[PDB]
Design a protein around this nucleic acid. Structure first.
Ligand SMILES: [Zn+2]
Lengths: 140, 171, 232, 344, 47, 183
RNA sequence: GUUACUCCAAAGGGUGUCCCUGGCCUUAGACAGCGG
RNA sequence: CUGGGGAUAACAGAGUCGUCUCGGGCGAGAGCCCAUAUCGACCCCGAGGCUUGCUACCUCGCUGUCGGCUCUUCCCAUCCUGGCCCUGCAGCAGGGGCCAAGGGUGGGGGUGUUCACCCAUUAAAGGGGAACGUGAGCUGGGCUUAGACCGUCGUGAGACAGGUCGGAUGCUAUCUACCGGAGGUGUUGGCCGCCUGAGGGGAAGGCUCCCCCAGUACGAGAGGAACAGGGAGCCGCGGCCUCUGG
RNA sequence: CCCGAAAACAGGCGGCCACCGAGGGCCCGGGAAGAAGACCC
């Protein structure tokens, strides 16, 4: 047991489906300067001939900032998907979906660049990144 | 420059006359005698060509420099009369083709020079005393490396008789 | 190797004569060297055009320039004309030269506030910001002095020779003497009854962490040191 | 150059119609327990349960959704014993012994049954086979079995098959077979709840299909879609070799293939249509009946996951020729809910 | 942490300067190439 | 060729019985009995009154080498059935002491470099191993099997991933059949 | 290797084996070993 | 426009290998000393036929095209994955070399582009051949007709291996080949059923990350592994419709 | 794991008939199978 007290990652047994390919615009839910981002990459993914990388809830993506204060605009950031419109299954068999697609901006390690998340987030995301539910007021 | 297998052989007529060859080049070799020239040494170690051959002046000069540096670092200028016996008289030519006209009017312009040697002919000689035959053989080897074909060395005494086997046995 | 020979021309007296030179030996030829213009050129003439084929009239040259030899008029074409270096080569050479300059300055220049060095990266940044006129045919060593002042105000710094006083408990002195004198300028090498080496060195001042870290790695962190005045 | 894997597998070729609707078993597992190594039944339908997870891995100890297939298994009848010997290359049949009293319907598969063949003749033949086996020539003993499709009113023409016996002693195998012949055999005497199984059946038919669906070929650019080539492959190959290669994807028969699956878990064995969960006896048949299959009434297997075949197709089962190293326990798991709502 | 017993069995080896193959202790030429230059396996660090 | 009738001879000691059965050599002595097959085209092994004689009647270099090799093998067999052979191993470590133990036909080594997994060496039949602290003895009646057991115990500890000037832990032979190993 | 030619890879190396020649030590020689 | 020409070019092929791609021998030296950890001048010896040239043996209505999409296969001179050796290899990483072609080698921006350049990921994002694989498979952006504009050359009609806009894409398969599906004869009388399994095919699997071993070995410190043991996922393959979507 | 008695040593076993007739096909009601044929009840 090396480093568990100060930690950024955990395990989740659900593995939702991949609903957002490269090119998708995400509304930002954290209280950072950014408002809208665009997906240009999915961390950890390897594909095939003429396949677009896609992401779902709990995955870390590489994105560009399109709207927000000039300090953040035109930069390449990392972020985590915290809710999606495409329904995904759980262990009991009941499906779950949300009202919109949204993300939260983090550091390559997994540390949030912000102190407040607005709206409900997914337990899958909160489980895989233990430093988010702390700063989220609703986790379903 | 171009590979030496182009000029190795001797199947072409001799081309050694400068009152008729237009634009012929000068030699890049000026020194043929090195060391001590008036010292009457005992043993004469001479290289010999194994077949007929055509040696470039570039190879000649490289041989000269290497062998002389070796003999200086090991034997000492006071010894080792070193001589190259052959002079470059042949003129080598290349066809100026590579817009071009290909094989139209092909007769080469002169590029370089070479020395012609026949079978069992002497190329170079080291005159040395007994206590440096090791280094004379080393020089033989070094020169052998830098030649287009193969060559063999022999040894001679005063009166110029072969004592190579007797001297090789007893070291 | 005419495949990638480039062109240089001199326009004067109402005509146009190109040449086919090696792009990296023309560099030396106009930089200032003992020049084998034979090796420089690709074809041994002077011509209207490299892609057409028309070598001009000998007495036309005689008239305009004054020479009969073609190598001499090509020499003067390279003198007073312009070479057709590709944008690739121009960019690459420009960058390499200004990198050379940035190193040549950083290695011995620092700010008189605290003695920190100025990294080559932000040296390059200050250059690109102020706007520097790097010549691609001039000698770097000789064009730096201008670039000094053109960038001093935007980024002030001085040529600040650091002078240091160093201690070693010599057990690896036979392992550090040569290594540390590779730098140079070692003054008053002194000793002690405990075989311990004490001295005062006068190296340039920009490179300090190199010296410190190499000494620490070579002595297993068993070295004492003190910075005397930064004699400029 | 762009690299990518080829489209489809070459391990299941030629992709042709199966030789028979009754599937053949090619290899048998090595078992120390002296028992019949398989059973056969008819596929009925699918449902789902909620159970507490047993197997190693994450999710262990939690309540999970599990899909389930139901296979109706009426008892088989053992009508024969075969002996095998070793020939030059492989095994060859040495002789057969049959029972004398067989159902009237067996003649629908075997049109030519013996005329008199009384019990004393049957016993004399058994004795001959026994003495033959008692020497040392014989190498393997197998049972001859037929289904009884008339109990569940599905049809009247039985399916006739051969099944191997576990162990490594021909004499033990023969004692088992001699105590079995002439009788009905149930699935609870052969299978154990919690086992892993391999299932064998012929897949659903789909007729002739093109390469997009038969091999996973791509649909061409929309210009080709408007040219008349959208659902075609580009070319059949290069100039040299000046022939079409067998590896090039083409249209042909799709479906109705012999296929084998690995490591499907047996959850529970039911009797007379009922399952006992917590003292209760509940019916697996959903309200309204299984779609395209009626009511289950005799005996049934509950198998995890999916299995090849249409609904009323004959299925064969064998134990785990190739199991993993971290098997789950051989014991019925804890089931919290079984769905028996309408399925249409 | 010197262990001469370990050294006598790790470092009693010759190496060929042409191909790099290892050779027995008393070899005069190499096995794969016939080169006559063999140097002992390095027992202290160089440079 | 080299000579005419190359012939080597061995004198049979106190109570050693040597027999030939067509290409095999049986050697019985106070302890144990050994067998070995030795054949090469043209080489004859036969027993005289009190001698082992190896003969070839028009030999080349390779035949001479074969003959001398066979002679050495027979001498080893004789010495083995007479006295025996004894090899010695030394255990060394810097950190993580490791425990070596004998388990049936295997030697097991634990805590080598701190690994959670044990290394295993196979003992050949007719060999006995004794562990007393940092020193190990392999005693046996036949030299090939004895040396092979020793070599296996050694090769169960070999590293490939780190510099051996620094990582030197393991087990090493120090004495072969009564012959120290020196650099 | 089992190739007359049409239509067959080298410089440089080899205690691989079979031969020829010429010197030098030998009844205590040329390795290793008891003993500086 | 007519008549002809493979007596003669562009064009693929044959030949050749100067050039090109890949190597070797010897040893001046560089490397604190130390040729050979690494680098290795000058000079000599080669392989391949994947670059361009040379020649003019084949074809003058065989097809005269570049690039892209789609589909299959082979070579190794190996980029990653498996296993080893030396080091100027403490550890983490790096250099160099040996065995191995089973699997992998992707997505985007400008440009008709191949190539080259840049971006973010990645275990890595190797390079070649098959008529510069593949138009009786597609496309038609470039190139190479007839229309038109600019610049330059020319008295002019006009031209430019200079730039720019626009500019036709045919087939009922005779033989063989392949994917699947049937009817016969033979197997020495006819028929029903169950088996064997000679031969052929297979990638049916490949790879990554996390936990623990462990802040341990190593190391002055900064930093920082491994064997075993536990989990999850991506790519590929084969099936099914209980659940969810169309 | 898939194909596989046309495997030319063109196989083994059990059973039925012949040495009027065993067996098979057309036909009829239909699919879980299907371009014609074939397959299954
Ligand atoms: Zn070597």
């Amino acid at each position: 047991a090396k480093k568990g007290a100060g930690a950024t990652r955990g395990i989740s047994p659900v593995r939702p489906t991949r609903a957002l390919p490269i090119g998708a615009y995400l509304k930002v839910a954290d209280n950072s300067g950014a408002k809208v981002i665009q997906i240009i990459g999915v961390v950890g993914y390897k594909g095939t001939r003429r396949r677009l990388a896609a992401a779902g809830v709990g995955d870390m993506v590489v994105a560009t900032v399109k709207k927000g204060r000039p300090d953040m605009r035109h930069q390449v950031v990392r972020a985590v998907v915290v809710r999606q419109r495409k329904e995904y299954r759980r262990l009991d068999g009941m499906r779950v979906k949300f009202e919109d697609n949204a993300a939260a901006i983090v550091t390559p390690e997994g540390v949030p660049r912000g102190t407040e998340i607005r709206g409900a987030i997914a337990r899958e995301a909160a489980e895989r990144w233990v430093r988010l539910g702390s700063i989220a007021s609703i986790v379903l | 420059l171009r590979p030496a297998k182009i000029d190795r052989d001797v199947d072409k007529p001799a081309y050694t006359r400068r009152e008729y060859i237009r634009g012929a080049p000068g030699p890049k070799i000026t020194i043929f005698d090195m060391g001590n020239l008036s010292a009457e040494f005992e043993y004469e170690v001479s290289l010999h060509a194994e077949q007929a051959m055509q040696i470039r002046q570039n190879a000649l000069e490289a041989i000269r420099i290497q062998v002389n540096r070796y003999l200086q670092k090991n034997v000492g200028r006071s010894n080792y009369h070193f001589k190259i016996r052959v002079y470059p008289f042949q003129v080598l030519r290349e066809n100026p083709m590579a817009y071009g006209n290909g094989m139209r009017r092909p007769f080469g312009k002169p590029i370089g020079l070479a020395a012609r040697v026949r079978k069992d002919q002497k190329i170079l000689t080291v005159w040395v005393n007994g206590q440096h035959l090791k280094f004379a053989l080393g020089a033989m080897h070094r020169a052998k490396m830098k030649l287009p074909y193969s060559a063999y060395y022999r040894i001679y005494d005063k009166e110029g008789n072969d004592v190579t086997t007797k001297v090789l046995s007893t070291m | 190797s005419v495949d990638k020979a480039v062109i240089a021309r001199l326009k004067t007296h109402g005509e146009t004569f190109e040449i086919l030179v090696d792009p990296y030996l023309a560099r030396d030829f106009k930089e200032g060297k003992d020049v084998p213009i034979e090796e420089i050129l690709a074809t041994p003439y002077v011509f209207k055009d490299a892609h057409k084929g028309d070598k001009a009239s000998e007495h036309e040259m005689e008239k305009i320039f004054g020479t009969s030899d073609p190598y001499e008029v090509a020499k003067i074409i390279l003198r007073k004309g312009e070479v057709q270096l590709t944008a690739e080569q121009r960019r690459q050479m420009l960058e390499d030269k200004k990198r050379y300059i940035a190193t040549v300055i950083h290695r011995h220049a620092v700010d008189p506030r605290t003695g920190y060095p100025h990294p080559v990266d932000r040296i390059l940044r200050a250059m690109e910001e102020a706007g520097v006129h790097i010549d691609i045919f001039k000698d770097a060593e000789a064009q730096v002095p201008q670039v000094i002042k053109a960038i001093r105000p935007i980024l002030p710094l001085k040529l600040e020779v650091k002078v240091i006083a160093v201690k070693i408990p010599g057990d690896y002195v036979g392992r550090a003497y040569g290594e540390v004198r590779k730098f140079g300028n070692i003054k008053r090498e002194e000793w002690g009854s405990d075989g311990s080496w004490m001295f005062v060195i006068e190296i340039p001042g920009g490179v300090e962490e190199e010296f410190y870290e190499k000494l620490n790695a070579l002595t297993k962190g068993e070295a004492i040191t003190k910075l005397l005045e930064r004699k400029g | 150059k762009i690299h990518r894997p080829r489209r489809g597998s070459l391990a299941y070729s030629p992709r042709k119609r199966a030789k028979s609707i009754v599937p053949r078993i090619r290899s048998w597992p090595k078992d120390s327990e002296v028992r019949m190594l398989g059973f056969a039944g008819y596929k009925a339908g699918m449902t789902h349960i909620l159970m507490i997870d047993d197997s190693p891995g994450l999710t262990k100890g939690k309540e999970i959704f599990v899909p389930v297939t139901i296979v109706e298994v009426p008892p088989l009848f053992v009508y024969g014993i075969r002996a095998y010997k070793q020939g030059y290359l492989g095994l060859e049949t040495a002789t057969e012994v049959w029972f004398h009293d067989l159902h009237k319907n067996v003649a629908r598969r075997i049109k030519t049954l013996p005329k008199n063949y009384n019990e004393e003749a049957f016993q004399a033949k058994l004795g001959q086979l026994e003495d033959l086996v008692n020497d040392g020539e014989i190498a393997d003993v197998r049972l001859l079995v037929h289904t009884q499709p008339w109990l569940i009113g599905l049809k009247k023409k039985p399916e006739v098959m051969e099944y191997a016996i576990g162990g490594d002693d021909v004499k033990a195998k023969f004692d088992y077979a001699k105590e079995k012949i002439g009788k009905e055999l149930r699935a609870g005497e052969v299978l154990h709840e919690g086992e892993l199984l391999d299932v064998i059946a012929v897949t659903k038919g789909k007729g002739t299909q093109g390469p997009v669906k038969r091999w996973g070929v791509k649909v061409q650019f929309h210009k080709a879609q408007r040219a008349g080539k959208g659902r075609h492959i580009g070319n059949l190959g290069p100039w040299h070799p000046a022939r079409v290669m067998w590896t090039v994807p083409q249209a042909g028969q799709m479906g109705f293939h012999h296929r084998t699956e690995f490591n499907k878990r047996l959850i529970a064995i039911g009797e007379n249509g009922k399952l006992v969960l917590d003292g209760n006896e509940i019916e697996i048949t959903p309200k309204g009946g299984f779609p395209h299959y009626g009511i289950v009434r005799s005996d049934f297997l509950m198998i995890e996951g999916t299995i090849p075949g249409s609904f009323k197709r004959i299925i064969r089962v064998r134990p785990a020729i190739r199991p993993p190293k971290k098997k789950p326990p051989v014991e019925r798991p804890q089931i919290t809910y079984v769905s028996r709502e309408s399925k249409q | 942490a010197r262990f001469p017993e370990a050294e006598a069995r790790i470092f009693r080896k010759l190496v060929c300067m042409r191909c790099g193959a290892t050779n027995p202790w008393g070899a005069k030429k190499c096995r794969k190439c016939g080169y006559k230059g063999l140097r002992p396996k390095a027992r202290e660090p160089r440079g | 060729p080299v000579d005419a009738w190359i012939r080597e001879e061995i004198e049979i000691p106190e109570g050693v019985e040597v027999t030939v059965e067509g290409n095999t050599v049986k050697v019985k002595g106070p302890k144990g009995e050994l067998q070995r097959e030795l054949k090469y085209p043209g080489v004859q092994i036969f027993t005289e009154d009190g001698k082992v004689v190896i003969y070839k009647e028009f030999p080349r270099k390779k035949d001479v080498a074969i003959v001398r090799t066979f002679k050495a093998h027979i001498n080893n067999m004789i010495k083995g059935v007479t006295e025996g052979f004894k090899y010695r191993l030394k255990v060394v470590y810097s950190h993580f002491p490791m425990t070596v133990k004998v388990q049936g036909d295997e030697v097991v080594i634990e805590n080598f470099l701190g690994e959670k997994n044990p290394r295993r060496a196979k003992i050949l039949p007719g060999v006995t191993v004794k562990v007393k602290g940092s020193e190990i003895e392999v005693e046996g009646i036949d030299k090939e099997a004895v040396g092979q057991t020793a070599a296996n115990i050694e090769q169960a500890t070999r590293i490939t991933k780190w510099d051996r000037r620094v990582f030197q832990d393991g087990i090493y032979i120090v004495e072969k059949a009564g012959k120290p190993i020196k650099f």
